[PDB]
Amino acid sequence: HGFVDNATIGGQFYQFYQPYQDPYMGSPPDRISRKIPGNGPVEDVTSLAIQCNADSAPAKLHASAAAGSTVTLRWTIWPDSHVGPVITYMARCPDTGCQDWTPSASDKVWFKIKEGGREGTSNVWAATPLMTAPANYEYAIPSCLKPGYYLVRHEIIALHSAYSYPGAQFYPGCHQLQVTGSGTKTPSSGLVSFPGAYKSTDPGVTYDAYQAATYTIPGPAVFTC
Ligand SMILES: *[C@@H]1O[C@H](CO)[C@@H](O[C@@H]2O[C@H](CO)[C@@H](O)[C@H](O)[C@H]2NC(C)=O)[C@H](O)[C@H]1NC(C)=O
Ligand SMILES: [O-][O-]
Ligand SMILES: [Cu+2]
C-alpha cells in the first residue's frame, strides 16, 4: 500500500496527485500526475486500471525535462512484506499533449525504460530500498527520445500474495512529461498495451516469493538507445 508522493523532474519539485487531500477540496489542484483512488492495489491484469490505476484521468500539467536527465520519485512508506519488482514505462502522447489523452486498452504504445526484480534467489528485491526511508527511486529519461509529450507509468508489483492469481498486487501510477533536447528517436519495438502486457499466467505474475527461486520480470524488453 502506497503511491508516489512527489518527484524531482527537470530539477524541479512536484507534488503528485494526493488521493487523501485533493478530492475534498472545492477545486482540486492542477497536477502533473494522474488521479488514483488511494494507496490500494490493482489485482486485475485485464483491467484498464492496470495502466494508470483505477478510475484514473488525464492530468492538467506536464513537467519539462531534458532527454537523458534523471528523475527522482519518492514513495510513501513501503511495507516490508511487499517484496517485488519495480518497473517504469513511457509512452508518447499526441503532440497536442497528454492532458486529454489516454491510451486505449489495445494501444501498443508503452515502452519499458527501467526494471528491477529479485536479486538471485534471496529476499532482496527492487522494492526493498523503498522499505527504508527516504523511499526514493530514480530513472533516466532515455537520451535519444524525440522531444514531445510523454506519459510515464511507474509501478511496484508486490508478490507476497501471488502464489495464485488473482494475487499479485500492482501499484501503478502515471505522470506527464514534456521531454526536450536533441533526441531523434521514437520507440517502435518492444511496445505493449496496458492491459495486454501482462498475463495472469506469466511466471512473474503467478509466483511463489517464498521459495528459493529466481524471478522473471514481466513485460517487454527494456528500450535502449
Ligand atoms: C516527498 O515525499 C516523500 C515520501 O512520502 C516525503 O518523505 C517523509 O518526509 C519526512 C520529512 O522530510 C521524512 O522525515 C520522512 O522520512 C519521509 N518519508 C518517506 C517515506 O520517505 C517528503 O517529505 C516529501 N517532500 C516534500 C517536499 O513534501
Ligand atoms: O494493507 O497493507
Ligand atoms: Cu499493501
XYZ file of N, CA and C and ligand atoms in Angstrom:
706
model
N 0.857 -1.217 0.000
C 0.000 0.000 0.000
C 0.858 1.219 0.000
N 0.666 2.054 -1.012
C 1.348 3.321 -1.099
C 1.192 3.899 -2.496
N 1.802 5.050 -2.716
C 1.804 5.704 -4.022
C 2.998 6.638 -4.112
N 3.296 7.095 -5.324
C 4.328 8.095 -5.478
C 3.782 9.422 -4.952
N 4.460 9.981 -3.957
C 4.009 11.180 -3.238
C 4.451 12.463 -3.959
N 5.676 12.449 -4.464
C 6.214 13.587 -5.198
C 7.435 13.171 -5.994
N 7.938 14.108 -6.784
C 9.096 13.870 -7.630
C 9.937 15.112 -7.841
N 11.131 14.890 -8.362
C 12.001 15.966 -8.806
C 12.292 15.678 -10.270
N 11.741 16.514 -11.149
C 11.814 16.347 -12.600
C 12.366 17.636 -13.215
N 13.378 17.515 -14.065
C 13.990 18.692 -14.661
C 14.518 19.627 -13.602
N 14.873 19.059 -12.456
C 15.409 19.830 -11.358
C 14.383 20.490 -10.470
N 13.097 20.305 -10.781
C 12.006 20.985 -10.073
C 11.172 20.004 -9.266
N 10.672 20.461 -8.124
C 9.837 19.646 -7.242
C 8.388 19.674 -7.708
N 7.763 18.501 -7.754
C 6.350 18.389 -7.997
C 5.677 17.483 -6.972
N 4.627 17.976 -6.328
C 3.804 17.122 -5.512
C 2.844 16.400 -6.427
N 2.812 15.081 -6.327
C 1.923 14.295 -7.172
C 0.470 14.419 -6.679
N -0.472 13.977 -7.519
C -1.852 13.821 -7.126
C -1.927 13.166 -5.740
N -2.745 13.754 -4.871
C -2.873 13.325 -3.470
C -4.273 12.767 -3.245
N -4.419 11.424 -3.221
C -5.750 10.837 -3.115
C -6.425 11.065 -1.749
N -5.655 11.421 -0.715
C -6.199 11.701 0.615
C -6.170 13.199 0.934
N -6.094 14.039 -0.107
C -6.179 15.515 0.066
C -7.023 16.158 -1.056
N -6.672 15.831 -2.301
C -7.166 16.559 -3.462
C -8.665 16.439 -3.672
N -9.235 15.233 -3.506
C -10.673 15.109 -3.780
C -11.609 15.942 -2.906
N -11.124 16.395 -1.757
C -12.004 17.039 -0.799
C -12.001 18.522 -0.944
N -11.068 19.050 -1.727
C -11.015 20.481 -1.969
C -12.156 20.884 -2.884
N -12.640 22.108 -2.718
C -13.628 22.644 -3.639
C -13.134 22.641 -5.073
N -11.860 22.975 -5.241
C -11.209 22.985 -6.545
C -9.911 22.189 -6.415
N -9.918 20.906 -6.830
C -8.685 20.119 -6.742
C -7.542 20.754 -7.543
N -6.317 20.731 -6.998
C -5.191 21.405 -7.639
C -4.742 20.729 -8.935
N -4.295 21.529 -9.904
C -3.678 21.000 -11.120
C -2.463 20.182 -10.716
N -2.269 19.051 -11.380
C -1.140 18.168 -11.090
C -0.474 17.711 -12.386
N 0.764 17.239 -12.276
C 1.417 16.559 -13.400
C 1.168 15.052 -13.418
N 0.586 14.522 -12.346
C 0.311 13.092 -12.234
C -1.173 12.855 -12.175
N -1.543 11.642 -12.571
C -2.916 11.279 -12.829
C -3.576 10.755 -11.561
N -4.866 11.036 -11.461
C -5.726 10.621 -10.367
C -5.559 9.142 -10.040
N -5.499 8.836 -8.751
C -5.509 7.453 -8.247
C -6.550 7.390 -7.116
N -7.061 6.184 -6.788
C -8.129 6.093 -5.792
C -7.688 6.253 -4.334
N -6.403 6.063 -4.107
C -5.891 5.789 -2.760
C -4.652 4.930 -2.882
N -4.249 4.303 -1.785
C -2.981 3.585 -1.734
C -3.088 2.068 -1.984
N -4.280 1.593 -2.353
C -4.535 0.166 -2.509
C -4.146 -0.426 -3.860
N -4.045 -1.758 -3.939
C -3.577 -2.402 -5.167
C -4.632 -2.597 -6.239
N -4.148 -2.724 -7.476
C -4.903 -3.228 -8.598
C -4.496 -4.698 -8.712
N -5.471 -5.580 -8.901
C -5.208 -7.008 -8.957
C -5.697 -7.681 -10.245
N -6.200 -6.893 -11.190
C -6.777 -7.432 -12.425
C -5.923 -6.982 -13.617
N -5.107 -7.894 -14.170
C -4.243 -7.533 -15.310
C -5.024 -7.284 -16.600
N -6.301 -7.638 -16.618
C -7.155 -7.430 -17.797
C -7.932 -6.112 -17.726
N -7.760 -5.357 -16.642
C -8.462 -4.086 -16.438
C -7.626 -2.880 -16.892
N -8.299 -1.872 -17.428
C -7.650 -0.602 -17.695
C -7.033 0.006 -16.429
N -7.484 -0.426 -15.256
C -6.893 0.088 -14.015
C -5.395 -0.261 -13.911
N -4.958 -1.290 -14.635
C -3.556 -1.682 -14.579
C -2.651 -0.647 -15.260
N -3.240 0.220 -16.086
C -2.491 1.223 -16.834
C -2.009 2.342 -15.916
N -2.942 3.118 -15.370
C -2.634 4.291 -14.553
C -3.409 4.293 -13.216
N -3.790 3.090 -12.779
C -4.585 2.849 -11.584
C -6.089 3.030 -11.877
N -6.928 2.686 -10.898
C -8.375 2.629 -11.079
C -9.003 4.014 -11.173
N -9.964 4.131 -12.090
C -10.754 5.343 -12.290
C -9.879 6.578 -12.452
N -8.807 6.415 -13.218
C -7.882 7.493 -13.442
C -8.392 8.454 -14.515
N -7.636 9.521 -14.711
C -7.966 10.557 -15.676
C -6.693 11.307 -16.056
N -6.679 11.948 -17.239
C -5.501 12.724 -17.592
C -5.228 13.834 -16.584
N -3.960 14.233 -16.473
C -3.534 15.313 -15.583
C -3.439 16.590 -16.402
N -3.601 17.726 -15.748
C -3.709 19.013 -16.425
C -2.335 19.543 -16.852
N -1.268 19.138 -16.160
C 0.067 19.698 -16.388
C 1.083 18.668 -16.873
N 2.161 19.186 -17.467
C 3.352 18.408 -17.778
C 4.545 18.998 -17.075
N 5.519 18.145 -16.738
C 6.801 18.562 -16.191
C 7.888 18.522 -17.275
N 8.554 19.659 -17.506
C 9.606 19.757 -18.507
C 10.885 19.083 -18.025
N 11.527 18.326 -18.903
C 12.809 17.690 -18.570
C 13.565 17.372 -19.847
N 14.884 17.443 -19.784
C 15.726 17.082 -20.909
C 15.805 15.567 -21.052
N 15.772 15.084 -22.291
C 16.060 13.694 -22.540
C 17.445 13.408 -21.967
N 17.604 12.257 -21.328
C 18.884 11.867 -20.738
C 19.012 12.255 -19.274
N 18.168 13.176 -18.798
C 18.185 13.609 -17.398
C 17.577 12.579 -16.446
N 17.926 12.701 -15.168
C 17.410 11.827 -14.124
C 16.193 12.420 -13.414
N 15.220 11.548 -13.139
C 14.038 11.849 -12.354
C 14.096 11.073 -11.038
N 13.730 11.724 -9.935
C 13.541 11.083 -8.645
C 12.059 10.960 -8.353
N 11.636 9.764 -7.989
C 10.304 9.556 -7.463
C 10.417 9.183 -5.992
N 9.514 9.698 -5.167
C 9.517 9.400 -3.741
C 8.188 8.761 -3.355
N 8.245 7.505 -2.913
C 7.080 6.769 -2.448
C 6.761 7.083 -1.026
N 5.486 6.927 -0.698
C 5.067 6.816 0.692
C 5.723 5.561 1.302
N 5.650 5.378 2.620
C 6.405 4.305 3.263
C 5.972 2.918 2.785
N 6.928 2.118 2.304
C 6.613 0.847 1.664
C 6.688 -0.300 2.646
N 5.586 -1.053 2.843
C 5.614 -2.146 3.827
C 6.621 -3.254 3.488
N 7.354 -3.752 4.482
C 8.444 -4.717 4.211
C 7.997 -6.090 3.716
N 6.720 -6.411 3.864
C 6.184 -7.623 3.281
C 6.091 -7.521 1.751
N 5.977 -6.308 1.204
C 5.623 -6.118 -0.224
C 6.848 -6.215 -1.126
N 7.522 -7.364 -1.083
C 8.616 -7.646 -1.995
C 8.075 -7.748 -3.422
N 8.897 -7.386 -4.391
C 8.506 -7.461 -5.787
C 9.367 -6.562 -6.638
N 9.178 -6.643 -7.957
C 9.860 -5.801 -8.914
C 9.331 -4.375 -8.942
N 10.128 -3.479 -9.506
C 9.770 -2.082 -9.707
C 10.057 -1.817 -11.187
N 9.088 -1.243 -11.906
C 9.181 -1.149 -13.358
C 8.672 0.205 -13.824
N 9.359 0.799 -14.802
C 8.960 2.080 -15.360
C 8.874 2.021 -16.881
N 7.756 2.528 -17.402
C 7.488 2.621 -18.817
C 7.228 4.074 -19.250
N 7.328 4.329 -20.545
C 6.874 5.599 -21.111
C 6.026 5.329 -22.345
N 5.249 6.332 -22.719
C 4.507 6.314 -23.992
C 4.413 7.735 -24.543
N 4.559 7.900 -25.857
C 4.479 9.222 -26.453
C 3.026 9.634 -26.613
N 2.670 10.764 -26.010
C 1.359 11.349 -26.195
C 1.275 12.044 -27.537
N 0.051 12.331 -27.986
C -0.083 13.163 -29.169
C 0.634 14.500 -28.960
N 1.057 15.139 -30.045
C 1.787 16.394 -29.935
C 0.921 17.520 -29.373
N -0.397 17.323 -29.387
C -1.360 18.214 -28.732
C -1.381 18.105 -27.186
N -0.700 17.094 -26.638
C -0.421 16.996 -25.205
C -1.060 15.774 -24.597
N -0.521 15.329 -23.461
C -1.139 14.262 -22.669
C -2.423 14.618 -21.934
N -2.744 15.906 -21.819
C -3.826 16.364 -20.914
C -5.259 15.927 -21.247
N -5.461 15.386 -22.435
C -6.754 14.852 -22.825
C -6.626 13.526 -23.564
N -5.544 12.794 -23.296
C -5.235 11.557 -23.979
C -5.070 10.453 -22.982
N -5.719 9.326 -23.249
C -5.432 8.094 -22.534
C -5.353 6.959 -23.549
N -4.225 6.241 -23.574
C -4.157 5.096 -24.470
C -5.322 4.132 -24.252
N -5.859 3.583 -25.334
C -6.890 2.574 -25.203
C -6.300 1.268 -24.699
N -7.187 0.346 -24.336
C -6.827 -0.974 -23.837
C -5.999 -1.788 -24.829
N -6.103 -1.458 -26.115
C -5.372 -2.174 -27.162
C -4.286 -1.342 -27.845
N -4.050 -0.125 -27.352
C -2.980 0.728 -27.875
C -1.595 0.236 -27.423
N -0.832 -0.339 -28.354
C 0.528 -0.783 -28.064
C 1.480 0.405 -28.191
N 1.529 1.198 -27.129
C 2.253 2.472 -27.123
C 3.329 2.551 -26.031
N 3.362 1.570 -25.139
C 4.243 1.661 -23.981
C 5.561 0.961 -24.174
N 6.673 1.637 -23.860
C 7.981 1.028 -23.891
C 8.566 1.047 -22.498
N 9.204 -0.045 -22.123
C 9.829 -0.188 -20.826
C 11.148 0.552 -20.842
N 11.366 1.439 -19.866
C 12.643 2.140 -19.746
C 13.516 1.696 -18.555
N 12.921 1.076 -17.534
C 13.717 0.578 -16.416
C 13.003 -0.546 -15.692
N 13.769 -1.521 -15.187
C 13.185 -2.608 -14.412
C 14.186 -3.134 -13.410
N 13.649 -3.710 -12.342
C 14.436 -4.402 -11.353
C 13.570 -5.492 -10.776
N 14.179 -6.624 -10.429
C 13.447 -7.801 -9.974
C 13.917 -8.334 -8.638
N 14.137 -9.644 -8.578
C 14.650 -10.342 -7.394
C 16.155 -10.513 -7.545
N 16.927 -10.256 -6.485
C 18.362 -10.467 -6.556
C 18.654 -11.943 -6.328
N 18.905 -12.665 -7.417
C 19.108 -14.094 -7.351
C 17.893 -14.783 -6.747
N 18.146 -15.598 -5.732
C 17.094 -16.319 -5.022
C 16.948 -15.808 -3.590
N 17.529 -14.641 -3.302
C 17.453 -14.015 -1.980
C 16.096 -13.342 -1.755
N 15.961 -12.703 -0.599
C 14.760 -11.936 -0.309
C 14.939 -10.448 -0.531
N 15.991 -10.073 -1.255
C 16.212 -8.689 -1.641
C 15.667 -8.480 -3.041
N 14.816 -7.473 -3.173
C 14.138 -7.164 -4.436
C 14.312 -5.713 -4.779
N 13.890 -5.321 -5.973
C 13.959 -3.907 -6.351
C 13.105 -3.037 -5.418
N 12.021 -3.589 -4.870
C 11.198 -2.836 -3.916
C 11.871 -2.623 -2.549
N 12.889 -3.413 -2.223
C 13.480 -3.385 -0.893
C 13.984 -2.014 -0.438
N 14.749 -1.280 -1.279
C 15.202 0.026 -0.795
C 14.077 0.972 -0.373
N 12.918 0.859 -1.021
C 11.784 1.712 -0.708
C 11.173 1.416 0.662
N 11.565 0.286 1.257
C 11.090 -0.121 2.578
C 11.815 0.606 3.728
N 12.845 1.390 3.409
C 13.650 2.134 4.388
C 13.744 3.598 3.973
N 13.178 4.487 4.781
C 13.089 5.898 4.422
C 14.473 6.516 4.307
N 14.651 7.503 3.392
C 13.657 8.009 2.425
C 13.390 7.028 1.279
N 12.115 6.780 0.985
C 11.730 5.770 -0.007
C 11.839 6.290 -1.431
N 13.078 6.422 -1.925
C 13.361 7.032 -3.236
C 13.806 6.093 -4.376
N 13.373 6.463 -5.581
C 13.642 5.737 -6.814
C 14.087 6.728 -7.881
N 15.042 6.330 -8.714
C 15.450 7.154 -9.849
C 15.245 6.427 -11.163
N 14.933 7.183 -12.217
C 15.019 6.695 -13.589
C 15.620 7.766 -14.504
N 16.199 7.315 -15.612
C 16.738 8.234 -16.609
C 15.839 8.215 -17.821
N 15.391 9.399 -18.226
C 14.688 9.569 -19.490
C 15.675 9.233 -20.601
N 15.346 8.233 -21.451
C 16.312 7.858 -22.477
C 16.780 9.074 -23.275
N 18.082 9.183 -23.486
C 18.673 10.383 -24.058
C 18.326 10.622 -25.529
N 17.911 9.569 -26.239
C 17.617 9.661 -27.672
C 16.163 9.991 -27.997
N 15.292 10.141 -26.995
C 13.888 10.392 -27.279
C 13.672 11.719 -27.995
N 12.863 11.677 -29.043
C 12.445 12.867 -29.762
C 11.647 13.754 -28.823
N 11.883 15.067 -28.874
C 11.099 15.931 -27.993
C 9.593 15.759 -28.200
N 8.843 15.813 -27.108
C 7.397 15.714 -27.176
C 6.824 15.586 -25.794
N 5.551 15.235 -25.739
C 4.842 14.999 -24.507
C 4.777 13.500 -24.310
N 5.102 13.032 -23.107
C 5.147 11.622 -22.830
C 4.483 11.336 -21.500
N 3.828 10.187 -21.430
C 3.293 9.661 -20.190
C 4.356 8.711 -19.637
N 4.509 8.726 -18.320
C 5.371 7.789 -17.611
C 4.495 6.918 -16.716
N 4.629 5.604 -16.835
C 3.926 4.659 -15.983
C 4.929 3.978 -15.106
N 4.730 4.122 -13.806
C 5.613 3.525 -12.822
C 4.831 2.620 -11.890
N 5.379 1.452 -11.574
C 4.728 0.507 -10.690
C 5.698 -0.235 -9.804
N 5.161 -0.634 -8.649
C 5.689 -1.746 -7.852
C 4.682 -2.889 -8.002
N 5.176 -4.117 -8.172
C 4.320 -5.296 -8.149
C 4.650 -6.073 -6.878
N 3.795 -5.960 -5.871
C 4.024 -6.707 -4.628
C 3.544 -8.147 -4.761
N 4.416 -9.091 -4.390
C 4.185 -10.512 -4.654
C 3.993 -11.396 -3.431
N 3.763 -10.775 -2.282
C 3.564 -11.508 -1.036
C 2.326 -12.367 -1.024
N 1.386 -12.089 -1.928
C 0.142 -12.864 -2.032
C -0.097 -13.385 -3.457
N 0.981 -13.680 -4.173
C 0.894 -14.001 -5.614
C 1.029 -15.491 -5.979
N 1.000 -16.364 -4.984
C 1.087 -17.801 -5.212
C 0.083 -18.271 -6.241
N -1.107 -17.705 -6.187
C -2.101 -17.938 -7.232
C -2.587 -16.605 -7.794
N -3.450 -16.674 -8.802
C -3.996 -15.474 -9.414
C -5.521 -15.531 -9.365
N -6.180 -14.398 -9.035
C -5.592 -13.105 -8.669
C -4.792 -13.190 -7.390
N -3.817 -12.309 -7.255
C -2.972 -12.330 -6.074
C -1.896 -11.262 -6.109
N -1.164 -11.231 -7.220
C -0.174 -10.188 -7.421
C -0.817 -8.814 -7.232
N -0.115 -7.888 -6.562
C -0.651 -6.560 -6.285
C 0.141 -5.515 -7.063
N -0.545 -4.842 -7.989
C 0.071 -3.832 -8.829
C -0.263 -2.456 -8.294
N 0.740 -1.593 -8.194
C 0.603 -0.250 -7.668
C 1.090 0.724 -8.764
N 0.295 0.879 -9.844
C 0.702 1.742 -10.957
C 0.244 3.164 -10.773
N 0.952 4.066 -11.427
C 0.639 5.481 -11.391
C 1.331 6.148 -12.546
N 0.735 7.212 -13.066
C 1.225 7.864 -14.255
C 1.473 9.352 -14.032
N 2.573 9.850 -14.586
C 2.838 11.266 -14.637
C 3.227 11.709 -16.030
N 3.197 13.025 -16.248
C 3.251 13.595 -17.576
C 4.468 14.482 -17.735
N 5.209 14.225 -18.816
C 6.453 14.932 -19.109
C 6.373 15.708 -20.431
N 7.096 16.826 -20.487
C 7.470 17.444 -21.731
C 8.961 17.192 -21.840
N 9.331 16.238 -22.680
C 10.725 15.928 -22.915
C 11.297 16.879 -23.970
N 12.444 17.462 -23.659
C 13.120 18.419 -24.518
C 14.474 17.857 -24.924
N 15.155 18.547 -25.836
C 16.508 18.180 -26.238
C 16.707 17.837 -27.704
N 17.759 17.068 -27.953
C 18.295 16.842 -29.281
C 18.035 15.422 -29.785
N 17.249 14.643 -29.043
C 16.928 13.288 -29.456
C 16.110 13.244 -30.733
N 16.247 12.146 -31.461
C 15.537 11.958 -32.728
C 14.723 10.665 -32.817
N 14.691 9.884 -31.736
C 14.122 8.541 -31.787
C 12.708 8.472 -31.214
N 11.864 7.708 -31.895
C 10.562 7.297 -31.407
C 10.579 5.776 -31.291
N 10.446 5.248 -30.063
C 10.446 3.793 -29.936
C 9.370 3.127 -30.806
N 9.773 2.100 -31.554
C 8.865 1.337 -32.413
C 9.106 -0.170 -32.337
N 9.723 -0.617 -31.249
C 9.752 -2.033 -30.926
C 9.659 -2.213 -29.423
N 9.314 -3.417 -29.000
C 9.072 -3.681 -27.590
C 7.874 -2.922 -27.036
N 6.974 -2.486 -27.910
C 5.794 -1.749 -27.493
C 4.691 -2.699 -27.038
N 4.020 -2.321 -25.955
C 2.938 -3.115 -25.370
C 1.759 -2.246 -25.001
N 0.619 -2.881 -24.758
C -0.550 -2.173 -24.229
C -0.807 -2.541 -22.774
N -1.491 -1.659 -22.062
C -1.974 -1.954 -20.711
C -3.487 -1.696 -20.689
N -4.315 -2.749 -20.525
C -3.956 -4.169 -20.382
C -3.408 -4.812 -21.642
N -2.730 -5.933 -21.454
C -2.185 -6.726 -22.538
C -0.786 -7.225 -22.265
N 0.060 -6.350 -21.725
C 1.467 -6.665 -21.476
C 1.640 -7.863 -20.554
N 0.756 -7.960 -19.561
C 0.867 -8.969 -18.527
C -0.281 -9.939 -18.635
N 0.050 -11.214 -18.474
C -0.929 -12.278 -18.400
C -0.877 -12.893 -17.033
N -2.042 -13.314 -16.559
C -2.171 -13.913 -15.249
C -1.181 -15.068 -15.069
N -0.904 -15.794 -16.152
C -0.054 -16.975 -16.128
C 1.445 -16.660 -16.279
N 1.818 -15.389 -16.440
C 3.238 -15.058 -16.551
C 3.985 -15.527 -15.308
N 5.226 -15.988 -15.492
C 5.992 -16.537 -14.378
C 6.298 -15.506 -13.293
N 6.232 -14.228 -13.634
C 6.432 -13.158 -12.662
C 5.159 -12.585 -12.077
N 4.012 -13.128 -12.466
C 2.710 -12.649 -12.004
C 2.068 -13.674 -11.069
N 2.074 -14.937 -11.482
C 1.776 -16.043 -10.580
C 3.120 -16.605 -10.159
N 3.475 -16.325 -8.915
C 4.836 -16.509 -8.457
C 4.856 -16.774 -6.971
N 5.688 -17.722 -6.552
C 5.863 -18.055 -5.134
C 7.140 -17.384 -4.602
N 6.964 -16.256 -3.926
C 8.103 -15.451 -3.486
C 8.806 -16.048 -2.277
N 8.268 -17.139 -1.740
C 8.793 -17.721 -0.523
C 9.524 -19.012 -0.777
N 9.731 -19.355 -2.048
C 10.694 -20.402 -2.367
C 11.959 -19.764 -2.923
N 13.055 -20.507 -2.840
C 14.366 -20.024 -3.243
C 14.471 -20.209 -4.744
N 13.836 -19.299 -5.476
C 13.799 -19.346 -6.934
C 14.200 -17.988 -7.491
N 14.677 -17.968 -8.730
C 14.868 -16.701 -9.454
C 13.525 -16.151 -9.955
N 13.533 -14.919 -10.469
C 12.312 -14.206 -10.846
C 12.414 -13.653 -12.269
N 11.391 -13.904 -13.084
C 11.312 -13.372 -14.440
C 10.418 -12.137 -14.413
N 11.015 -10.970 -14.625
C 10.268 -9.718 -14.632
C 9.287 -9.706 -15.792
N 8.007 -9.381 -15.522
C 7.004 -9.300 -16.599
C 7.248 -8.177 -17.599
N 6.620 -8.315 -18.763
C 6.644 -7.269 -19.763
C 7.748 -7.405 -20.783
N 7.862 -6.398 -21.653
C 8.758 -6.448 -22.783
C 10.198 -6.158 -22.408
N 11.098 -6.260 -23.371
C 12.473 -5.885 -23.132
C 12.583 -4.376 -22.849
N 13.643 -3.993 -22.155
C 13.914 -2.602 -21.854
C 14.381 -1.890 -23.133
N 13.786 -0.737 -23.402
C 14.210 0.118 -24.508
C 15.642 0.584 -24.303
N 16.437 0.557 -25.367
C 17.812 1.033 -25.320
C 18.087 1.873 -26.559
N 18.746 3.016 -26.366
C 19.058 3.933 -27.467
C 20.181 3.384 -28.345
C 8.348 13.782 -0.589
O 7.535 12.649 -0.466
C 8.244 11.891 0.497
C 7.678 10.488 0.614
O 6.416 10.467 1.235
C 8.306 12.640 1.836
O 9.296 11.973 2.578
C 8.772 11.990 4.530
O 9.401 13.246 4.684
C 9.772 13.441 6.032
C 10.166 14.898 6.253
O 11.110 15.297 5.289
C 10.886 12.442 6.374
O 11.270 12.595 7.727
C 10.423 11.001 6.107
O 11.483 10.081 6.283
C 9.795 10.870 4.720
N 9.082 9.642 4.416
C 9.427 8.806 3.438
C 8.547 7.603 3.234
O 10.414 8.985 2.732
C 8.780 14.088 1.676
O 8.564 14.866 2.830
C 8.081 14.759 0.511
N 8.731 16.006 0.208
C 8.144 17.195 0.305
C 8.999 18.379 -0.042
O 6.974 17.365 0.662
O -2.823 -3.223 3.967
O -1.353 -3.341 3.749
Cu -0.226 -3.150 0.502
